[PDB]
């Protein structure tokens, strides 16, 4: 497309150009209002529901300045979040870490969006104000003049909710005149009347105004919780006053009051101050009620996700936890439940009715006089507020609050996905218990015991150097056929010879199912036979999760890369590559076709906003890829690593492709960072963003390339700071040659530990560079070990990780108390019955738990190969075994001793009444 060439040419980060709303520069007044607005809404405001502190890496009012700096760098200087988080951290720490900088970046889109609507809505209010001034200068009882307080409300708007209130209020009073204004400015009116426009066409304004308080004054009595405004009293009864407005549309005084009460009720419901006060109150007081439908009472069984909450009575929305409200909306969308949000406690009590919100607020419009004239006006005021709360506000506030509780619950699920992806990308390359990498033998198999095991040997660069098929390695040494033992002995010798010849540093076995334990026990023994012969150095034997390798094997890429290879052997290569570098491997399966979503991040991940989840996951790549740094020469030499270049800060997929395209066209390595400007024609702002994160292996270069090699290019020192890094090395040696000094310091890094950096921070501050304390401590740490891998060192999976990885279960899907289906495999001697679950756990039913009644011989109840329903009592994660029961008293759980814990607000009285 034309856009791709404009993106390649333009000196801005690709993700700044691909952002929905274009990034525009900001004046210091806009940045200060935005910094305060982002601080209130994104950092100070607590969630309505109980959310875990998901900051896995309230922030105080000092954060407002740190946000003002961060927005200045993003909007005016065009730095992405990683460049700020790694190369401007002195201006944003300690309050903002890299995820908070992404949170600021995401909320700047929301601020810009709000300011755009608030400006266009101001253009509408100014045109309407001008149109009224023209009609007035050319007054009837229905003319409300749009004044400076109406404008000051709009300029004071702090959210899209408050904006929608100010717009709905404007439409109520002026929506009828909008088409007239636009035709006067130089199209036909969309027509429909809610009863309010009928009441205005009947001229009820002269009666609606006579109820006493104007809508704002009632708003102020609500806001302040006392009568700040006294109710103005008309000197007649309402039913007598109504006679003056009788016509064909309102034939009776009772109908004229019903029309005028409607017209007042809508004015109360669309007053911005009343909505603001009520919304504020509704978020404090709202109670969630849930009842199951005729479908729900049958379908929400013990195992269903909606079980713990199918009947809720009076649960405060402040007490919903984590994702619970998303599970409630899913169960409602499936038609299983009906949800109801009320500001009142629901119940049949007389005190229950007295305690309602309506009995509190009626007091803010009543006139406290006992005369029958005032008694009857207070009855009309009562019915106007009752209609304003019940028909408009309680409906509209329940829908607004439902959307907020659902957005908080979806955002928890998105944060839970990103927290899981972070935990996968943070694992370092395996280092045996290094500069030429590790040779890895990945071993893969299918769950079907007759399919062949495949092994693939990958060199430290990520190239497949050799491969092996073992058709009988799945057999057990205790097999009843000696032929199986013999055929496996040939494959064991074949693997033993392959290990002896190829000498890999680690063997990885697929976490496919429990037979991965059998492969690991055999592979560990074969490696121990080489150790007993003292033929070879220690080889690692690792269980590696195969979920990523399955997504690779099924990808278009795994065929395009190796068309000739069987699919199980393609999952053997990804199991070797994952332990060499998890980040380079995870970048392979994450294509422009959005293949990433096939990974099981969270049980609800398909029910959150797709575009928001993809941003939240690609931000976990961008965080780690820029911390780890990308070797461009490894990308050019080995096509396998080319996927990381798009996640480098500033680059993205179009500029990333273009960088490799020029270096391929020139047929040159990237020899020094200056070549990004001098060969690749990269603009200064894109160079600024990426230059610190691109690695160049200066030790790999030689011959005529020796003419220009900056030794710092292999490190996180940014090119803007090379002068200070050279000065720091020259001064650490006290030399009376900067390149020689730097080489001498890089060979002898211990000499730096005496150097007082704070005096140099004062000198750079004095030279006008500002505070550089954190930068100088980082340059000193960087010269002490160039590109030290900041990832968490590899560890073998623990007992809980192995169990979850091989059963494909979690503590939530395989819990004590669960009901399950199993096949009987045998009888233990009788001590109990052996079974196998579908997930591969070997279940055991001790003989006393086989029935409610004493069974002496299990053969009276069960046969080998029989399928049986059972209930879990205890789990042994180390042994892959569970203590099951099938006593009918436990199966139906007649005492309710095993069933999942219900919510605290579960309505046992409705449950008992429906039974």
């Amino acid at each position: 497309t034309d856009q791709d060439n404009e993106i390649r040419a333009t000196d801005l980060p690709e993700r700044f150009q691909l952002r929905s709303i274009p990034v525009k520069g900001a004046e210091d007044d806009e940045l200060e209002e935005e910094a305060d607005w982002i601080y209130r809404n994104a950092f100070a405001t607590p969630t309505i529901s109980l959310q875990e502190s998901c900051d896995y890496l309230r922030k105080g009012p000092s954060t407002i300045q740190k946000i003002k700096e961060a927005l200045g760098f993003m909007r005016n200087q065009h730095f992405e979040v990683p460049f700020i988080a790694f190369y401007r951290k002195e201006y944003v720490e300690p309050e903002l870490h890299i995820n908070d900088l992404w949170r600021v970046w995401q909320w700047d889109e929301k601020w810009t969006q709000l300011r755009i609507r608030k400006e266009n809505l101001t253009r509408l209010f100014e045109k309407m104000q001008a149109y009224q001034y023209e009609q007035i200068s050319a007054l009837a009882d229905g003319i409300r003049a749009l004044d400076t307080t109406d404008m000051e409300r709009l300029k004071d708007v702090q959210s899209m909710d408050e904006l929608k209130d100010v717009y709905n209020h404007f439409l109520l009073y002026y929506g009828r005149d909008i088409p007239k204004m636009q035709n006067a400015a130089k199209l036909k009116q969309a027509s429909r009347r809610d009863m309010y426009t009928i009441c205005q066409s009947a001229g009820l304004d002269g009666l609606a105004k006579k109820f006493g308080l104007t809508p704002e004054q009632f708003g102020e009595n609500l806001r302040d919780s006392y009568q700040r405004h006294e109710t103005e009293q008309f000197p007649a009864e309402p039913l007598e006053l109504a006679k003056d407005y009788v016509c064909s549309q309102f034939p009776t005084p009772e109908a004229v009051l019903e029309g005028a009460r409607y017209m007042v009720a809508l004015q109360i419901a669309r007053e911005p101050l009343v909505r603001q006060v009520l919304r504020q109150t509704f978020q404090e007081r709202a109670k969630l009620n849930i009842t199951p439908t005729k479908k729900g009472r049958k379908d929400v069984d013990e195992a269903h996700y909606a079980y713990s909450f199918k009947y809720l009575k009076n649960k405060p929305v402040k007490e919903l936890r984590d994702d619970q409200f998303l599970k409630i909306c899913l169960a409602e969308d499936e038609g299983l439940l009906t949800t109801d949000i009320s500001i009142d406690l629901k119940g049949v009590e007389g005190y229950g009715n007295d305690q309602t919100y309506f009995e509190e607020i009626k007091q803010f419009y009543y006139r406290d006089e006992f005369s029958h004239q005032v008694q009857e006006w207070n009855r009309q005021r009562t019915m106007a507020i009752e209609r304003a709360l019940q028909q408009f506000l309680y409906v509209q506030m329940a829908k607004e609050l439902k959307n907020k509780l659902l957005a908080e619950a979806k955002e928890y699920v998105i944060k839970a996905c990103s927290r899981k992806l972070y935990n996968w990308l943070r694992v370092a390359p395996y280092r045996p218990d290094q500069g030429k990498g590790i040779r890895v033998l990945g071993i893969a198999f299918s769950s079907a015991r007759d399919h062949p095991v495949f092994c693939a040997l990958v060199n430290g660069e990520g190239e497949v150097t050799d491969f092996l098929r073992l058709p009988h390695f799945t057999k057990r040494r205790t097999a009843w056929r000696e032929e199986e033992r013999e055929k496996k002995a040939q494959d064991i010798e074949t693997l033993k010879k392959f290990l002896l010849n190829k000498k890999p540093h680690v063997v990885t076995v697929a976490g496919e199912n429990r037979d991965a334990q059998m492969l690991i026990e055999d592979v560990k023994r074969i490696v121990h036979e080489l150790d007993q012969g003292q033929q070879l150095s220690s080889i690692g034997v690792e269980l590696v999760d195969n979920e990523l390798a399955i997504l690779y094997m099924n990808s278009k890429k795994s065929e395009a890369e190796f068309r000739d290879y069987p699919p199980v052997l393609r999952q053997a290569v990804s199991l070797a590559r994952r332990i060499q570098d998890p980040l380079i491997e995870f970048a392979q399966v994450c294509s422009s076709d959005e293949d990433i979503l096939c990974l099981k991040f969270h049980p609800l991940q398909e029910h959150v906003v797709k575009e928001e989840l993809l941003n939240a996951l690609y931000c976990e790549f961008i965080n780690r890829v820029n911390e780890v740094g990308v070797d461009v020469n490894r990308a050019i030499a080995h096509p396998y690593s080319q996927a990381l270049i798009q996640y480098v800060c500033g680059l993205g997929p179009r500029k990333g492709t273009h960088l490799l395209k020029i270096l391929k066209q020139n047929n040159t390595r990237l020899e020094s960072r200056t070549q990004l400007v001098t060969m690749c024609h990269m603009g200064p702002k894109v160079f600024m963003n990426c230059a610190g994160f691109l690695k160049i292996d200066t030790a790999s270069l030689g011959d005529s390339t020796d003419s220009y090699i900056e030794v710092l290019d292999g490190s996180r020192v940014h090119p803007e700071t090379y002068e200070w890094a050279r000065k720091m090395a020259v001064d650490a040696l006290e030399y009376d040659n900067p390149a020689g000094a730097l080489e001498e310091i890089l060979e002898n890094p211990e000499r730096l530990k005496d150097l007082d950096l704070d005096a140099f921070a004062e000198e750079l501050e004095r030279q006008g560079y500002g505070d550089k304390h954190i930068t100088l401590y980082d340059i000193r740490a960087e010269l002490s070990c160039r590109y030290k891998d900041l990832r968490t060192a590899y560890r073998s999976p623990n007992t809980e990780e192995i169990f979850n990885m091989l059963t494909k279960e979690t503590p939530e899907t395989f819990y004590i108390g669960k009901l399950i289906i199993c096949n009987v495999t045998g009888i233990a001697h009788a001590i109990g019955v052996k079974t196998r679950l579908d997930n591969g756990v070997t279940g055991f039913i001790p003989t006393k738990f086989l029935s409610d009644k004493v069974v002496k011989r299990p053969e009276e109840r069960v046969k080998v190969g029989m399928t049986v329903h059972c209930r879990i009592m205890k789990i042994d994660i180390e042994k892959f075994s569970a203590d099951l029961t099938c006593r009918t008293s436990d199966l139906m759980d007649r005492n309710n001793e095993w069933k999942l814990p219900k919510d605290t607000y579960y309505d046992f009285d409705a449950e008992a009444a429906d039974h």
Partner: peptide
């Protein structure tokens, strides 16, 4: 002209 001090203990 400037020099960073090795003054730290």
């Amino acid at each position: 002209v400037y020099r960073i001090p090795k003054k730290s203990q």
